[PDB]
Amino acid sequence: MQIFVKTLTGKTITLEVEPSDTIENVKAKIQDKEGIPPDQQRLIFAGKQLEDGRTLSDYNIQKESTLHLVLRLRG
Amino acid sequence: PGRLEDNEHLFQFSCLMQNKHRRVLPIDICNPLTKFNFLECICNCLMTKQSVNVNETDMCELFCPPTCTPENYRRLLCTSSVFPFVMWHDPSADTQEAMLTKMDQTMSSGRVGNSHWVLVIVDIEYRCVTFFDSLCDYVASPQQMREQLEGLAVSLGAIYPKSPFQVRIGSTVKVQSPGEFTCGAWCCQFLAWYLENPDFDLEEKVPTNPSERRALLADFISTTEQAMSRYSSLSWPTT
């Protein structure tokens, strides 16, 4: 199924998942599509931090649940 | 250089200031508040507060910060009176997508560059909008940018009934020098001085010596990240 991960930059990211892919699995593919590994970002859904360890099924991340992703932006 | 330069740590400061001064709202690091979406999201945010004043359970969901929950964003909206916005300017740039693609990987290059944090503080209790820049004139001239915020100020006066908002230049004396990457730290320091006293003048709070000024700021940065070192999560504060 598709979900989306809108970020600090708006460049919404289209990524097909499964109901029990993990948070570092999703972070494994945003490093396979923009090149930034599973320690450098932090996923946020419904005001709640996605723990590296868990999996979609735990949070009701159904089809297309807008997800969000915090980078480390230096200014 | 200084660890008050990352968007995440500037958010932790905004939370630290809501813990010490409860009238201030924390910042949202999730929409790009560069010069393009600069005054649109201020009008947007201050409106969804005045829509918060009447009973509202719908507009809070859409104009919510992503890191916050919309019930908590409504409670923090209804009780806050000071609203800071950190804006990211680059003088080499003039389109949102390129200023953004520039960021999209300026985060994965991760070097900083010619960046520069700016601060506007919108305070509905004074009906005042202060602008601060560590380098004063580096993002626009001091009396065009002032128009821009005298332009925002009258729009704000229209959705917040008592007359337009007041404008104060925060930055009068140049306080940064060359090759210093401490503009988030000066934005933080101005916000702390502001929240303690909104009618302070920064020229008496800054030493006229330059090296004494840098030593003060590095003492502030150390005190600040000591106060912040236990802020882990990024979510908006509960209390």
Q: DSSP string of chain B?
A: --SS-BHHHHHHHHHHHHHHSTTBPPP--SS--SSTTSSHHHHHHHHHHHHHHS--SSHHHHS--TTS-HHHHHHHHHH--EEEEEEEE-TT---HHHHHHHHHHHTTS---TT-EEEEEEEETTTTEEEEEETTSSSSS-TTTHHHHHHHHHHHHHHHS---PPEEEES--S----TT---HHHHHHHHHHHHHH-TT--HHHHS-SSHHHHHHHHHHHHHHHHHHHTT----S----
Domain boundaries, chain B: 1-239
Q: Contact B24/B80 with Cβ under 8 angstroms?
A: yes
Give the 3-state secondary structure of residue A17.
coil
* CB contact B100 to A (< 8 Å): yes
Q: CA separation (Å) from B116 to A66, B109, B180?
A: 30, 17, 11
Q: Contact B119/B85 with Cβ under 8 angstroms?
A: yes
Q: Contact B121/B84 with Cβ under 8 angstroms?
A: yes
What are B130's strand-pairing partners? B121, B168
Token pair listed for B202? 């920064």
Query: CB neighbours (10 Å) of residue A22?
Result: 19
For residue A71, the chain B residues in CB contact (below 8 A) are 7, 107-108
Query: CB neighbours (10 Å) of residue A60?
Result: 10
- Read off the DSSP letter of residue A16: E
Torsion B26-B69-B7-B219 (CA) sign:
positive
On whether residue A75 sits in a domain, the answer given is no
* CB contact B66 to A (< 8 Å): yes
Give the 3-state secondary structure of residue A22.
strand
Give the 3-state secondary structure of residue A10.
coil
For residue A8, the chain B residues in CB contact (below 8 A) are 7, 29-30, 32, 103, 107
**B82 backbone dihedrals φ, ψ, rounded to 5°:** -130, 130
Cα separation, A14 vs A64, in Å, equals 9
Number of domains in chain A: 1
On whether residue A39 sits in a domain, the answer given is yes
Q: Tell me the CATH number at A21.
A: 3.10.20.90
Q: What does the buried/exposed string (b/e) look like for B107-120 if buried means 16 or more CB atoms within 10 Å of the residue's CB?
A: bbeeebeebbbbbb
Sheet order of strands, A14-16 included: A14-16, A2-7, A66-70, A42-45, A48-49
The one-letter amino acid at B53: N
Taking the mean position of all CA atoms in its chain, how far away is CA B22?
16
Check CB contact under 8 Å for A6 and B116: no
* CB contact B8 to A (< 8 Å): yes
**A53 backbone dihedrals φ, ψ, rounded to 5°:** -55, -45
A64 phi-psi bin (left φ>0, alpha ψ -120 to 50, beta other): left
On whether residue A43 sits in a domain, the answer given is yes
**A16 backbone dihedrals φ, ψ, rounded to 5°:** -80, 130
Q: CA separation (Å) from B154 to B12, B19, B218?
A: 31, 31, 38
Q: CA separation (Å) from B202 to B72, B84, B220?
A: 34, 17, 15
Torsion B202-B206-B210-B214 (CA) sign:
negative
Write a three-state SS string for B145-175: HHHHHHHHHHHHHHHCCCCCCEEEECCCCCC
Residues B25, B183, B34: CA angle, nearest 5 degrees:
65
Q: CA separation (Å) from A56 to A25, A51, B115?
A: 10, 11, 36
What are B24's strand-pairing partners? B82
Task: Choose among A35, A40, A68: nearest Cβ to B66.
Answer: A68
Q: CA separation (Å) from B160 to B51, B164, B171?
A: 10, 9, 26
On whether residue A28 sits in a domain, the answer given is yes
On whether residue A65 sits in a domain, the answer given is yes
Token pair listed for A28? 């494994």
Experimental method: X-ray
Torsion B88-B91-B92-B95 (CA) sign:
positive
The one-letter amino acid at B180: E
The residues, ordered by sequence, that sit 6+ positions from B33 with a Cβ below 8 Å of its Cβ are B41, B85, B86, B87, B88
The residues, ordered by sequence, that sit 6+ positions from B190 with a Cβ below 8 Å of its Cβ are B119, B132, B170, B202
Check CB contact under 8 Å for A9 and B100: yes
The residues, ordered by sequence, that sit 6+ positions from B210 with a Cβ below 8 Å of its Cβ are B177
The residues, ordered by sequence, that sit 6+ positions from B98 with a Cβ below 8 Å of its Cβ are none
On whether residue A26 sits in a domain, the answer given is yes
Cα separation, B21 vs B40, in Å, equals 26
Taking the mean position of all CA atoms in its chain, how far away is CA B150?
17
Sheet order of strands, B82-89 included: B82-89, B116-123, B128-133, B166-169
Cα separation, B80 vs B58, in Å, equals 19
Cα separation, B74 vs B153, in Å, equals 23
Cα separation, B230 vs B21, in Å, equals 18
Domain boundaries, position A34? 2-70
* Active-site residue (options: B68, B183, B187, B188): B183
Q: CA separation (Å) from A18 to A1, A7, A36, A41?
A: 6, 20, 21, 20
Check CB contact under 8 Å for B32 and A46: no
Cα separation, B178 vs B196, in Å, equals 29
